[PDB]
Design a protein around this ligand. Structure first.
Ligand code: NA
Length: 214
């Protein structure tokens, strides 16, 4: 089954939270902790019969790319995931050719480490290889939308059986660790999908989202 609810945005989404820990599971939420005026994330009816409702992430107001932890479309999942492989799929439309759209799947309620900083725990994108991809995130997947004004399939596999302890690249972060997810890991019981379009000036629309065990 699709684990994402309101997958085609047939129900209007307006709920904003200031932290995913406050989001009601099984619903979409809007995270926009960027400064007032930087981005607008909102529900829309598109006029396109194939994707008639969508979320629009509009970075027209941005002077800089937006932050991974500040501005995104999210959905918290508390149904209890299995250690296994999952596919996340959706359709996206960009105002400008080449605009990226992005994904990560993060633990909702993190503990702090010995040094007082919140952990950042993510499921590993399945194709991550730290040796071959020293400059890439192991958590966040990015896909360039090649054409403007065209609904485009976005597909990424995640391994819920592996986690990474940072969103940063291996080269940038000697503390980065990939590990096997514990059977009792908190992330399996309470996580959220984040869909983002961070580029300054870009406008990305999102519709028809699926998360499925494969
Ligand atoms: Na705004």
């Amino acid at each position: 089954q699709n684990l994402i609810k309101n997958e085609k945005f047939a129900t209007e989404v307006t709920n904003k939270v200031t932290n995913p820990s406050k989001a009601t599971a099984g619903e979409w939420f809007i995270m926009n902790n960027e400064a007032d005026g930087v981005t607008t994330i909102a529900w829309e009816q598109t006029g396109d019969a194939k994707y008639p409702n969508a979320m629009k992430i509009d970075n027209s107001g941005a002077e800089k790319n937006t932050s991974w932890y500040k501005a995104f479309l999210g959905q918290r999942i508390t149904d209890g995931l299995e250690k296994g492989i999952y596919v996340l799929t959706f359709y996206a439309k960009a105002k400008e050719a080449g605009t990226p759209v992005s994904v990560y799947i993060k633990q909702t309620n993190e503990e702090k480490n010995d040094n007082g900083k919140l952990n950042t725990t993510f499921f590993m994108r399945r194709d991550y290889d730290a040796d071959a991809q020293p400059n890439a995130s192991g958590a966040q997947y990015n896909f360039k939308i090649k054409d403007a004004d065209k609904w485009t399939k976005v597909v990424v596999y995640y391994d819920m059986g592996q986690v990474v302890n940072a969103i940063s690249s291996k080269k940038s972060n000697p503390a980065l660790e990939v590990s096997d997810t514990d059977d009792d890991a908190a992330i399996l019981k309470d996580c959220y999908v984040a869909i983002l379009g961070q580029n300054k000036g870009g406008v990305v629309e999102i519709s028809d989202v699926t998360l499925k065990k494969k």
